[PDB]
């Protein structure tokens, strides 16, 4: 009826289409025909059942991983945000960063002619426009997106700003950089990943308040206070940032029986130059504590009148334990020196 010639006896036929029909070349094109003429509604409903080829097994992991993370954040207290993957070539300047490696040939507008190499610029920018529309006292958010440098990459950045948290009515607040870090650390605490920060010079980050980020023993992303020069180049006050690369590495848990025998407690302080970083300090103390160091915390420190003008004090709470048996004091005040010795012996 569609003007085709059908030769053959079956089961496979010779069908020559009318010349005015150019969309008819394959057998499938021919099937689509019977279908539309019979009516797509005359096709029944069904569901397939099969055991999927093995190489398809794990597949979801990556995606899944990204989402659990996405979720934890929101549960931790971050508002998620969605930003255009575009970038104003000009901002490569405005924000002290290298130029975009990818440019559009048909940009939507000269201010979205490149491809974001960084996420945070967009965040900060959002901050601004929010302030101008509605005046939020504080703000804490994040965004996960693809940035483009030599290779496409999945990045995660977060921004904090405002008075901080604390009692609304009551005077004080607690905010600033150490707040952002506070959250950051808790996040990894939740992901079961070891994270720490080490001062690092960043063109876009105020120095002194600059620092690279070390997830479980690795260097990825940074964290810090937004360099004021930029803070002001924009009608903006002080802001705090951090931008990482995903996927986050992962430490497969190795469960470990905790012992019942009570721990060995200790009071201890360290006096070292005002410049020295907490890091190395904890590092050393820790690396010398011995194989029975259960805990290691810092409950206090201050510059301090009663000591060397260029040195500081360190409140370190210590705990020890032995799986199989209780720890004999012989080994405690002993290993304690093992540290103190190489402590400032260095």
């Amino acid at each position: 009826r569609l003007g085709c010639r059908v030769e053959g006896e079956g089961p496979t036929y010779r069908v020559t289409p009318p010349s005015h029909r150019l969309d008819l070349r394959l057998e499938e094109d021919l099937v689509e025909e019977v279908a539309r003429i019979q009516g797509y509604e005359t096709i029944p409903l069904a569901l397939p059942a099969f055991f999927p080829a093995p190489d398809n097994r794990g597949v979801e992991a990556p995606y899944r991983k990204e989402q659990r993370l996405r979720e934890v954040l929101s549960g931790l207290g971050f508002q998620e945000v969605y930003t255009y993957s575009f970038m104003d070539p000009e901002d490569a300047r405005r924000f002290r960063l290298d130029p975009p490696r990818l440019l559009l040939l048909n940009p939507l507008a000269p201010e979205k002619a490149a491809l974001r190499t960084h996420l945070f610029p967009g965040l900060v920018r959002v901050l601004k426009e929010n302030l101008d529309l509605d005046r939020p006292e504080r703000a804490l958010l994040f965004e996960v997106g693809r940035v483009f440098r030599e290779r496409e990459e999945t990045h995660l950045a977060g921004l904090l700003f405002g008075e901080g948290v604390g009692l609304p009515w009551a005077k004080e607040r607690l905010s600033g950089y150490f707040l952002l870090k506070g959250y950051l650390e808790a996040l990894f605490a939740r992901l079961g990943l070891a994270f720490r920060v080490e001062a690092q010079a960043f063109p876009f980050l105020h120095p002194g308040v600059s620092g690279r980020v070390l997830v479980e023993g690795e260097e990825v992303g940074f964290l810090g206070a937004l360099h004021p020069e930029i803070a002001q180049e924009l009608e903006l006050p002080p802001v705090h940032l951090f931008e990482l690369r995903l996927p986050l590495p992962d430490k497969p848990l190795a469960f470990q029986d905790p012992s019942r025998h009570p721990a060995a407690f200790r009071d201890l302080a360290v006096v070292v130059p005002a410049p020295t970083p907490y890091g190395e300090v904890e590092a050393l103390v820790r690396e010398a504590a011995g194989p029975y160091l259960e805990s290691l915390a810092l409950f206090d420190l201050y510059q301090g009148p009663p000591l060397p003008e260029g040195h500081k004090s360190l409140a370190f709470h210590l705990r020890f334990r032995h799986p199989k048996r209780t720890l004999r004091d012989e080994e405690v005040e002993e290993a304690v020196s093992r540290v103190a010795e190489a402590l400032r012996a260095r």
Binding site: R57, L180, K181, G182, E185, G192, V197, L253, P277, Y278
Partner: protein, 265 residues
């Protein structure tokens, strides 16, 4: 400023391993179209024993050490919010849910039922009185055992493998014939793990369901349909999976333990 310094001591939460394991198992069956639903920890001897072909004075009732209860003014709800009767007890397994669900619904369907169960037993390194199970039920015309077999097989793959495999041996249960116990191949640790029991839903169970339904005014729905159900111990698997050595550890609210599973996901 010293950036290496510690930030504001913020609370980092975590989840209980059972919850994690439960979750994991659930996500698995969910991918095969199973839907999760829970039942009551306090049940009626009717749903716990009678509904499932379990006799009063015969050897079967004697496979579950039950906790009997007492007390008044306690209202037990039936599948349709009605009040039901029978000696009260602590669900001895999650199977009762099998019934409540069927009475309340229409085939075909696929459900899975996580839940804490209770058995009167002396608590040791591998035995508890309080633990969790995960029941599974799939009813519909045409269901056969091969389906159960595939079901379990998919589960294996999902847990270990594709270098893992399944073992099905015949075993006896009053609510399924054929009845069977199934083990799973653990490629890593190299051994066979007895996981749980399963089988083709027993005719007298279906009978029971319909009978109670009509007594409730509903039309029969399980005549001419087939089905299989299974149930497995969660703690065991969780222990093998997350590598825990003492089952008592789960109900032992020690933090040093619980935190160990903070980032499990």
């Amino acid at each position: 400023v010293d950036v290496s310094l510690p930030g504001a001591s913020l609370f980092s939460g975590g989840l209980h391993p059972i919850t994690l394991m439960e979750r994991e198992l659930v996500e698995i069956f969910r991918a095969l179209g199973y839907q999760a639903v829970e039942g009551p920890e306090v049940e009626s001897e009717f749903f716990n024993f009678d509904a499932l072909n379990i006799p009063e004075h015969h050897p079967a009732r004697d496979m579950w050490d039950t906790f009997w209860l007492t007390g008044e003014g306690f209202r037990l709800e039936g599948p349709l919010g009605e009040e039901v009767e029978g000696r009260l007890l602590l669900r001895t397994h999650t199977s009762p849910m099998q019934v409540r669900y069927m009475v309340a619904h229409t085939p075909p369907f696929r459900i899975v039922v996580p839940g804490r169960v209770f058995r009167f037993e002396q608590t040791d390194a591998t035995h508890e009185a309080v633990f969790h199970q995960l029941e599974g039920l799939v009813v519909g015309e045409g269901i056969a055992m091969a389906h159960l077999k595939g079901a379990i097989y998919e589960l294996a793959q999902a847990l270990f493998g594709p270098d893992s495999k399944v073992r099905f041996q015949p075993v006896y249960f009053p609510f399924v014939e054929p009845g069977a116990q199934f083990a799973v191949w653990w490629p890593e640790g190299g051994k066979w793990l007895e996981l749980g029991g399963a089988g083709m839903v027993h005719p007298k169970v279906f009978q029971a369901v319909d009978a109670y339904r009509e007594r409730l005014g509903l039309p029969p729905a399980y005549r001419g349909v087939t089905g299989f159900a299974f149930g497995l111990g969660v703690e065991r698997l969780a222990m093998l999976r997350y590598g825990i050595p003492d089952i008592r550890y789960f109900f032992g609210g020690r933090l040093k333990f619980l935190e160990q599973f903070k980032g499990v996901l």
